[PDB]
Structure formats: structure tokens, C-alpha cells
Design a protein that fits this description.
By secondary structure, this protein is α+β, with helices and mostly antiparallel strands. Zn(2+) 1 binds at residues 38, 41, 66.
């Protein structure tokens, strides 16, 4: 209150006579060339020694030291000069100028005085009466030196003695003008203290105070003296003082002087002296008075006039920072800051303190950015010519540095706060609040700059980081709020059903387990925000463009917070599977899109393989599962529809049936659903491919199986189209599987998906072999039948250099006759199969058939039932009427015809495979036996009949031979010394005298020229007869001993009658080749055992029925004991 009313009064006084009424003294230096007296002090001006100043405008003559002590303006001092030259009336005139100035001022600017009244809340009547007071303080006070004076006589020291006591009873009189007063008396003292005050009136600075000290005589002498002298109280001394030496308040001691005829004087008097030319010395330092004025005015303007709205001033330039108000108010504070000097920066800091209480009002952040840029520029640069620091010049602020620092920090914090929710506090929908926002960051740069420049702080908070925190803050508050309120937000902001805009359950404003829609909704929220940040805020907040892309900070913050939440969601869905596979696939495309839009290009995530595919992968696998099972049900349907269609070929040249196509179509539709994800994690891809390669393997083996199963039922000799088509299906699987494997990225494929499909292809191959076999096999009975007929037809042909012209019928006619049963079957079927089998299929079929055929002929014709089943039977010791040249031909031509048929010009089998067919080469080889030489055949017999020695069926006795294989010392041939030691167990109890002897024979090749037989002497009546007789066979030199065997035979001697065979044993000379010599018991058989090659050779040697070696061989091997004299039957 005190300061407010003091400042009200001083503002009224300051502006009733505004200092802008005043005029300046144009002084010339002027020589007082005669003794002259100064119009201020009345002091001597004289010569050059004491020159004066003569004004022209005020005219006024004074000391130099007085030309400024001439206090009043050049109007008033022109008046006072005019009174001191002669015209006093000019003084009353300029008193009337002072009146008229104040009347005009009031009448012309009444709004100044009214505003001071309203700002200081004074009434109009009381304002009129305080205005009477400040009018009077310049209008009674228009020209006054009407001093009240208040003289405290304090004390004296060293006074003269005069007393009745012998000391003195000093009192004092004081006089000013005619008026006279006294102290009471100090008694008996020469150093008295009174401290006694006298008020006086003076009307002239050239008056004197008179002060006089008196010894108080109250005695008969003083009662007498009172009749003759005025001063009845013996005078102790005086001082006399000019009123112009006085001012304000004083406390001074003065030495004392004489006056009266009674005077004896010494010492001094102390006087306190007040002089009430003194006025408002009670100044709050005019700073503070101006502040009070300014705060009152500011609240009055903003709050009272403008209802708290900050009216931005009637301001001019950047120096709006110095024009705080409209004219009236501006002139108020300026006439105050002029009359009372208050510096422009102090005025400004006061205004910035005011504004900070309102900083949120529109445009105020631009004004405060301005005002602070200036208060900064002031302390940082204005008078930075002073070597004092900005922070210290700012300390020397009469406002108080600290008060200002606090104020900035509070404000800055309040800005940081508002920025931390920039979106909510400065919505993009208000460009005005986007501009206040922009001007706020301009203010915050201006504060950071003040801290850096005026406070001289070295690392103040960097304006970009300060704001980046606030943005991150505002973004995280956004994210929390969206993740918790997704439905309310997506609801109101976009939702594709108006019934879904409201407070949907929290399990749907955060994550649902039932649906993916919260997440599609959250995706759109995220997009929208990043857009607003990119689009409204990144431009609004461009001050740190390099540091502060609001759109990027948005995309990063929001995705990060999202991706966490989404990952857990996908894991949660995976436990429950309430949404369909498909829904997660749709969500995957949305998420794939979203990342690949906003996120992938932020450096942080450009740096990485996207992790999101790991979220969807189980749902893709689920889909692959649903897919495989559907595909396997489909597979069975397709196979069964095709089966119902009897497995027709898709066309007569599209050799597989339609199910193959359907399946590959399905598998491709399926694969493409996978492929359409393009998962950027190739191991998750690898997993899908492993999963699917299994699907494929399973489906295709299940096909190949369902085929392989039905296959044999179709192999019957009339549905033949169908097994062809099924093998073509199988092969077509392999073929399209190679394609699909390539489509899955071929050799680039996951090694285990690849492992699977390689395994699969190998199994499908092995299936196709077994089908080709099973197929070729169903014709086998027909083949065997036909081949037996061809064998029957061939048996009419014989060795036709030895037969008539119906069987010496040409090699061709015989071959044709022979061939005919098969050529019928062949031509039809191979043509049909060549038309309707895929070449892979056909080749396998044909190999199987070829083998089968070859083997069938080799058996059924070349080692035929029409030969050996006679010779080794009770039937004919066959020739097959000689398998000469002719039936070697016929067959070789038929084989060739067949080989051309199976070859089918390369449409069938390769002439290489056929020529190098073991089936053929064996067949050819058996054909070669038939034409061979007798000794080669006999050699083949002894070498193959190795078993002729190990085991005899029912022995008739045994022979002890000691045999020596001398590689002969006389010739280098092989000779065989057979020492016939004895026989034993001879089953020969004959009716005549028994006379046993032992024959020994040799068997092997090249024995036509050599003694094949020896015999011992006889022994009478003896069934274990000894001989000790030595024979010497010769072998060939060229054939080794393993080409030979002894054939021992005991016999009964009957001269003039006939000798009789008692038994037979074979000793292989292959043993004696090793043993060198051998004592051995040879069990005598009744016959000698053979194998099929003994018998094939014996069938070919029996054809040599005229060759004496072949006769004697066929005879000596068909040689047997008569059962007489010794019991049971032989065995084969």
C-alpha cells in the first residue's frame, strides 16, 4: 500500500507538470567587466577573475558554478532573470504558464490522470483532491522558497564564564527574520547540552539565522539592566548563518562571536538545523517506484481493461521491448522514467516479469522471445564496451539478476512442460497454436541463448535435446494412450461401423484373443500419428531441422512400442487359434506392408532382417497343415474321380491321367499362397519349405502308392492302356516334381526340404521300376506260352543240311513260322505301348519284357523242353535231329527280328543294351555249345562233373587204388601209375566160380589215340581180392589233370564165356594234381551221377552219334553195373 500510494502521488506530480513542459538555458560565457551579483547565489562576479554565464533565452546572469544551480527551466529562469533585470510581472506570467500548462495537460490528456486514478484504483473525487494536492505541489510550489526551519540548539563547548555561580548559566536565543525564541538554561556549565528545537519561517534564501548565547542572570542587576539593555543575561557569544548555506537537515558546530558592550566570548555552539524546502526525499529508489507503477499498470491493462488478455502494446520496432503500453500508459511510465531517470533495461525486465504471469496468451511467446532477445542483447552486447562480464553487468542490474534468473527458469520449465505435451497443448488443428508453438521454441532458443550469453553458462541444456525429450514424452504419452484406448481412438477416428466408436471392452482397446481387429486398428492409429508428426509438427518445429525430424522420431518411437506388443499378441493367438489361419495371413500382409512402409527405412531397422515373420510363422505352419490335409483329401478325391474315369490318358499324347494335373495344380495354388508371403527371414522360409516338402512327399508318395496298389489289378492283358497311363502318371509326377522343386527355388532350396524332395524322387523312381516289372510280368504267361509254341514250331526245323526242303525251308520262312506266335503279340502291344507310354516308362517296361523274353527263349527254346526233357528221360537220347547250323540260324534271325522289334528303330531299347544283353549273350552262348567240338564238350563235361567222386548212391563194394600222377620223366606228358591194390565188400556172390579182376579206365579230352583201359589178372573165389598190379595211363600233354578222371570198374573173369561188370567208381585227377599220389578207397557205384551241364554236353555229344569219341564217351558215362549177384537199384 505505502509504495503504491507514494507512487500514485509521484506519478500524478510527475505528469501534471510533465518534465516535457521544460526549456533549456542557452548560456554564453560572459565577463562581469564590473562587480556583479549572481542571480542564483547573489555572490560576486567580477572581471576575468570571477566570470559568469549570461543566458540568452533566460537572459540570466550567474556564476559558472551557479548556471546549473539556477534550478528552474528556461521559461522560469527567463521569468526570474526578467525580475532581476526589472520586470517582476514576468514571474507571475510564468506562474500562469505553469498553471496553463497543467490546465492544458489535464484538458488535453485527462486520460493520463484518469488512468493513474484507475490503475491506483483511487476515486474521481479523491483523485480531484490529491490532484489539488499535486497541482498545489507545483502551483502553490510554482516558485517557492518559503522554508520552514527547525533549529535544534544542541550544545556548546569552551564558553566564557559570566555567572552568579562563577561558571555560566548558558541559554541561547535563536532569531530568523524579526521572530525570536530561546532555549531553557543549562546552569553552572561552560560545555552545556540543550538539544532544544525552535521552529521558524523564512521566505528568502538571502536571510540570516542569528544564534546568541546568554548567561541567565536573574538578580537585582538584571532587573536594573532590563530598563536600559534588551539582553539582560550576560552574553556568552553568537553565530550568524546565511539561509542559502542551509538545506534539508544539518548538524554543525560554529565558533562564537561578540555583540553587546558587555561581551567577553569564547568557544563554539552545535546547532542541528532542519529546512523544509525538503520534499519527497522518501523516494523508494526510483527503480522500485517505477516497478510499482509498472506492475499496477500491467495488471490494470491486462486484467482490468483486457480481462486477463494481454493486449500487445501500441509498440514500435523490436523496441516493442521498450514500449510496454499504449501512448497514455507509455507516457505515464516514460515521464516517470524520465523525471526519475529509470533505465530502459530495468523497465524491460519489469515488463518481462509481468508478461511471464500470462505467457500462454496468443502471440506472447513471440513478444517474450523478442523482449528476451533484447534483454539478452542488452546485457550481452549493449555496454559490453565495459570489460565487465555479461553475467556481472547483469548482476549490476538494479532489477536484481537473481530475480530475473528465477523468472527465466520458471518460464523455461513452464515451456518444457507445455512442450512435453506439445500435441495436446498446441494441436495441429490450430495453426495459431502451431505458431505460438513455433514462437515458443524461438523463445526457448532465446532463453538457452540468455543462459549461454548473459548468465555465461558453458553447457546449458541444448534447445534441440530439451525439445527431443518433450517430443519423446509426448509420443510415449500418445503410445500409452493409444495402446490402452485403441478402440475409443480407432472408434472415433475411423471405425468402419458407428456402433464400434465407443468404449468397447478393455480386452479390445488393448489386445483381443478372439480377433485381429484391434491390431488392424492399432496399425491405422500408428499411421495417422506419424503422418501428423511428419506433416504438421516437423514443419512447425523446423528450428533444429538436422536434429528434429518429428515424423521420424514418431515412426521409431511408435513402431518400437508396437512391435513388442504385437509379438506378444501373435504368441498369445498361437495358444488359442480363435481367428482362422487366413486372418493371420491377412494381418501378415498388413504388417509386412506397414514395416516395409514406415519402419524398414529408419536406419535402426534398415540395419536388420525383419523379426515380424517369426510372429506369423506358426499361423503359416497351421495354414500349411490345413492345406496339406485338404490337399490329401483332395488327392484321394482326384485319384478317385480319375479312377471313376477308368484312368483315361489326358489325351492320346498327354499320356498320364488328369489327377496328376489336378494335384500339381493344387500343389502350385498351395505353394503360391506360401510364396506370396516372401518372408524376409530365410530360415523361417526354410521351415515352411521343410514343412511343405514333407506335404509334397506325403501327398506324392500317397499318390504313387494309391497307384502302385491299383496297378496290378490294371496289369491284366486288356486294360493295358491303364498301367501304361499309371506309369506315365508316376513319371509325370517325377517330371512335374522336378519343376515344382525348381519353383520352390531348385538348388537354392533349403537343404532338408531338398533332402526330402530328393528322397521322394528316388522312391518315385523305385516305385516306377516295380510298376514296370509288375506290368511286364502280367504278360509273362502269354510270352511263355507263345515262346513254347515258337519252340514247338522250331522242332519241325532240324539240322536241315541233313533234312528235306520243307524244313530246309529258308532260314527266313522257318524264322517267320517260328516267330509268328510272338510277333502278333509284340507288334500290336509294342505299337500300342509306343503310342501310349512315356519313354522312361516304356524303356523300363521293355527292359523287363526283354529280359523276360530272352530268358524265356533261352529256357523254352535253346535249352528247350524239346531237347533235354527227352535225353535225361526214358524218351530219346536226343539229337533234336541235330541242332546244326540251321536251327542256329532261324533262331539267330528270329533273335535279330525280335531285337529290331524291341529296338523299334530306337523308340524301344538301345541296340547297345540289346547287343550287350546278358540275356542275349547267354542265349548266344548256349547256342554256341550246340555246334562245339567233341573234346571241348568232353572237357566241359569233366570240368563241370567235379561231383563225380564226392558221393556214390548205394555202393556195391570199393577199390583200393594207389595212384601216382607222374608228370612223366621220359616225355613231360602226364602219366598215371594206377597200382590196383585190392577190392573190398564186392556184392557179387555168383553161381559159377567167382574170378574178379579190376579194369581201370581214363576219361577226359584227347583220348582217341591213348589206351583208355587196363585190366588186372583174376583172383579165384575172393570178394576182397588183392592184385598189387600197376597200370600206366597217358593223359594229354595240353589238358591238365583237372580235365581228367579215372573210371575204375571191377569185373568177373569167365574164359570162353563173357566177363561181367561188378561196379564203377570215378577218381578225379584234379585231386591227384594236388596230392601227386593217392592211396584211396573208391566206393563202387552202380552208375555215375551228372548235372545239367553234364547233361547239356551229353545232349550235344549224343548229337555226335557217329563220332567214335562222342559215342565212347556217351557210352562210358551211360555205363552201368548189372544188378545180378548184388541186389538193389541205382540212383541218378
Amino acid at each position: 500500500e505505502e509504495l503504491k500510494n507514494h507512487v500514485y502521488k509521484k506519478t500524478l506530480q510527475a505528469l501534471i507538470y510533465p518534465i516535457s513542459c521544460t526549456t533549456p538555458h542557452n548560456f554564453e560565457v560572459w565577463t562581469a567587466t564590473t562587480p556583479t551579483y549572481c542571480y542564483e547565489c547573489e555572490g560576486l562576479l567580477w572581471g576575468i577573475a570571477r566570470q559568469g554565464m549570461r543566458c540568452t533565452e533566460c537572459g540570466v546572469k550567474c556564476h559558472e558554478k551557479c548556471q546549473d544551480l539556477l534550478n528552474a527551466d528556461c521559461l522560469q529562469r527567463a521569468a526570474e532573470k526578467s525580475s532581476k533585470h526589472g520586470a517582476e510581472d514576468r514571474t507571475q506570467n510564468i506562474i500562469m504558464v505553469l498553471k496553463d500548462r497543467m490546465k492544458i495537460r489535464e484538458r488535453n490528456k485527462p486520460e493520463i490522470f484518469e488512468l493513474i486514478q484507475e490503475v491506483f484504483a483511487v476515486t474521481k473525487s479523491a483523485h480531484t483532491q490529491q490532484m489539488k494536492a499535486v497541482k498545489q505541489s507545483v502551483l502553490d510550489g510554482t516558485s517557492k522558497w518559503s522554508a520552514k526551519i527547525s533549529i535544534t540548539v544542541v550544545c556548546a563547548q569552551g564558553l566564557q564564564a559570566k555567572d552568579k555561580t562563577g561558571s555560566s548559566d548558558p541559554y541561547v536565543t535563536v532569531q530568523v527574520g524579526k521572530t525570536k525564541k530561546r532555549t531553557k538554561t543549562i546552569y553552572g556549565n561552560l560545555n552545556p547540552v540543550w538539544e532544544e528545537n525552535f521552529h521558524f519561517e523564512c521566505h528568502n534564501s538571502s536571510d540570516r539565522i542569528k544564534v546568541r548565547v546568554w548567561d541567565e542572570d536573574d538578580d537585582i542587576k538584571s532587573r536594573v539592566k532590563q530598563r536600559f539593555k534588551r539582553e539582560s543575561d550576560d552574553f556568552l557569544g553568537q553565530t550568524i548563518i546565511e539561509v542559502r548555506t542551509l538545506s534539508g537537515e544539518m548538524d554543525v558546530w560554529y565558533n562564537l562571536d561578540k555583540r553587546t558592550d558587555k561581551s567577553a566570548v569564547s568557544g563554539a555552539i552545535r546547532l542541528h538545523i532542519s529546512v523544509e524546502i525538503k520534499g519527497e526525499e522518501k523516494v523508494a529508489p526510483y527503480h522500485v517506484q517505477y516497478t510499482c507503477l509498472h506492475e499496477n499498470l500491467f495488471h490494470f491493462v491486462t486484467d482490468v481493461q483486457n480481462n486477463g488478455v494481454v493486449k500487445i502494446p501500441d509498440a514500435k520496432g523490436d523496441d516493442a521491448w521498450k514500449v510496454y503500453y499504449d501512448e497514455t500508459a507509455q507516457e505515464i511510465v516514460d515521464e516517470f522514467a524520465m523525471r526519475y531517470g529509470v533505465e530502459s533495461i530495468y523497465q524491460a525486465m519489469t515488463h518481462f516479469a509481468c508478461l511471464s504471469s500470462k505467457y500462454m496468451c496468443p502471440g506472447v511467446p513471440a513478444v517474450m522471445s523478442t523482449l528476451l532477445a533484447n534483454i539478452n542483447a542488452y546485457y550481452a552486447h549493449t555496454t559490453a564496451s565495459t570489460n565487465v562480464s555479461a553475467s556481472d553487468r547483469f548482476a549490476a542490474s538494479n532489477f536484481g539478476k537473481e530475480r530475473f534468473v528465477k523468472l527465466l527458469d520458471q518460464l523455461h520449465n513452464s515451456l518444457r512442460i507445455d512442450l512435453s505435451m506439445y500435441r495436446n497443448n498446441f494441436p495441429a488443428s490450430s495453426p495459431e497454436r502451431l505458431q505460438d508453438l513455433k514462437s515458443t521454441v524461438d523463445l526457448l532458443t532465446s532463453i538457452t541463448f540468455f543462459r549461454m550469453k548473459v548468465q555465461e553458462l558453458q553447457s546449458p541444456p541444448r534447445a534441440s535435446q530439451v525439445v527431443k525429450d518433450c517430443v519423446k514424452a509426448c509420443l510415449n504419452s500418445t503410445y500409452e494412450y493409444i495402446f490402452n484406448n485403441c478402440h475409443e481412438l480407432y472408434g472415433r477416428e475411423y471405425q468402419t461401423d458407428p456402433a464400434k466408436k465407443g468404449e468397447v471392452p478393455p480386452e479390445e482397446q488393448g489386445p483381443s484373443i478372439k480377433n485381429l481387429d484391434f491390431w488392424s486398428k492399432l496399425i491405422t492409429l500408428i499411421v495417422s500419428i506419424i503422418e501428423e508428426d511428419k506433416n504438421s509438427y516437423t514443419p512447425c518445429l523446423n528450428q533444429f531441422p538436422q536434429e528434429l525430424n518429428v515424423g521420424k522420431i514418431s515412426a521409431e518411437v511408435m513402431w518400437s512400442l508396437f512391435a513388442q506388443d504385437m509379438k506378444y499378441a501373435m504368441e498369445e493367438h498361437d495358444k488359442h487359434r480363435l481367428c482362422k489361419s487366413a486372418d493371420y495371413m491377412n494381418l501378415h500382409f498388413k504388417v509386412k506392408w506397414l514395416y516395409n512402409e514406415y519402419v524398414a527405412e529408419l536406419p535402426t531397422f534398415k540395419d536388420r532382417v525383419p523379426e515380424y515373420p517369426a510372429w506369423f510363422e506358426p499361423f503359416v505352419i497351421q495354414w500349411l497343415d490345413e492345406n496339406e490335409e485338404v490337399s490329401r483329401d483332395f488327392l484321394h478325391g482326384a485319384l478317385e474321380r480319375d479312377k471313376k474315369d477308368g484312368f483315361q490318358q489326358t489325351s492320346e499324347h498327354a499320356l498320364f491321367s488328369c489327377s496328376v494335373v489336378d494335384v500339381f495344380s493344387q500343389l502350385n495354388q498351395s505353394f503360391e499362397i506360401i510364396k506370396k508371403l516372401e518372408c524376409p527371414d530365410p530360415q523361417i522360409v526354410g521351415h515352411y519349405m521343410r514343412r511343405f516338402a514333407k506335404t509334397i512327399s506325403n501327398v506324392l508318395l500317397q499318390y504313387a502308392d494309391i497307384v502302385s496298389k491299383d496297378f496290378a489289378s490294371y496289369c491284366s492283358k486288356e486294360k493295358e492302356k491303364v498301367p501304361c497311363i499309371l506309369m506315365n502318371n508316376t513319371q509325370q509326377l517325377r517330371v512335374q516334381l522336378e519343376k515344382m522343386f525348381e519353383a520352390m527355388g531348385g538348388k537354392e532350396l533349403d537343404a532338408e526340404a531338398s533332402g526330402t524332395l530328393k528322397e521322394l524322387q528316388v522312391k518315385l523312381n523305385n516305385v516306377l521300376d516295380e510298376l514296370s516289372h509288375v506290368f511286364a510280368t502280367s504278360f509273362q504267361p502269354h510270352i511263355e506260352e507263345c515262346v513254347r509254341q515258337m519252340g514247338d514250331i522250331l522242332s519241325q526245323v532240324k539240322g536241315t543240311g541233313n533234312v528235306p526242303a520243307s524244313a530246309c525251308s529258308s532260314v527266313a520262312q522257318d524264322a517267320d513260322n517260328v516267330l509268328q506266335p510272338i510277333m502278333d503279340l509284340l507288334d500290336s502291344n509294342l505299337t500300342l505301348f509306343a503310342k501310349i507310354c512315356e519313354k522312361t516308362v516304356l524303356k523300363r517296361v521293355l527292359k523287363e519284357l526283354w529280359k523276360l523274353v530272352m530268358n524265356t527263349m533261352e529256357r523254352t527254346i535253346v535249352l528247350p523242353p524239346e531237347f533235354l526233357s527227352k535225353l535225361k528221360d526214358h524218351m530219346v537220347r536226343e539229337e533234336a535231329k541235330s541242332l546244326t547250323p540251321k536251327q542256329c540260324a532261324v533262331v539267330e534271325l528270329a533273335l535279330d527280328t525280335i531285337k529290331q522289334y524291341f529296338h523299334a528303330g530306337g523308340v524301344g531299347l538301345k541296340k547297345t543294351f540289346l547287343e550287350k544283353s546278358p540275356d542275349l549273350q547267354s542265349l548266344r552262348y548256349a547256342l554256341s555249345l550246340y555246334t562245339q567240338a567233341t573234346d571241348l564238350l568232353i572237357k566241359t563235361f569233366v570240368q563241370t562233373q567235379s561231383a563225380q567222386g564226392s558221393g556214390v548212391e548205394d555202393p556195391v563194394g570199393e577199390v583200393s587204388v594207389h595212384v601216382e600222377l607222374f608228370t612223366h620223366p621220359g616225355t613231360g606228358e602226364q602219366k598215371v601209375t594206377v597200382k590196383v591194390v585190392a577190392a573190398n565188400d564186392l556184392k557179387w556172390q555168383t553161381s559159377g566160380i567167382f574170378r574178379p579182376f579190376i579194369e581201370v579206365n581214363i576219361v577226359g579230352p584227347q583220348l582217341s589215340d591213348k589206351k583208355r583201359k587196363f585190366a588186372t589178372k583174376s583172383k579165384n573165389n575172393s570178394w576182397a581180392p588183392k592184385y598189387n598190379e600197376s597200370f600206366q595211363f597217358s593223359l594229354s600233354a595240353d589238358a591238365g589233370p583237372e580235365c581228367y578222371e579215372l573210371q575204375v570198374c571191377v569185373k568177373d573173369y569167365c574164359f570162353a564165356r563173357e566177363d561181367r561188370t561188378v561196379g564203377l567208381a570215378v577218381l578225379q585227377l584234379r585231386e591227384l594234381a594236388q596230392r601227386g599220389s593217392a592211396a584211396c578207397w573208391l566206393p563202387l557205384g552202380r552208375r555215375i551221377h551228372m548235372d545239367d551241364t553234364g547233361l547239356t554236353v551229353l545232349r550235344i555229344l549224343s548229337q555226335r552219334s557217329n563220332d567214335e569219341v562222342a559215342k565212347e564217351f556217351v557210352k562210358l558215362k551211360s555205363d552201368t553195373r548189372s544188378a545180378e549177384e548184388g541186389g538193389a537199384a541205382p540212383a541218378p
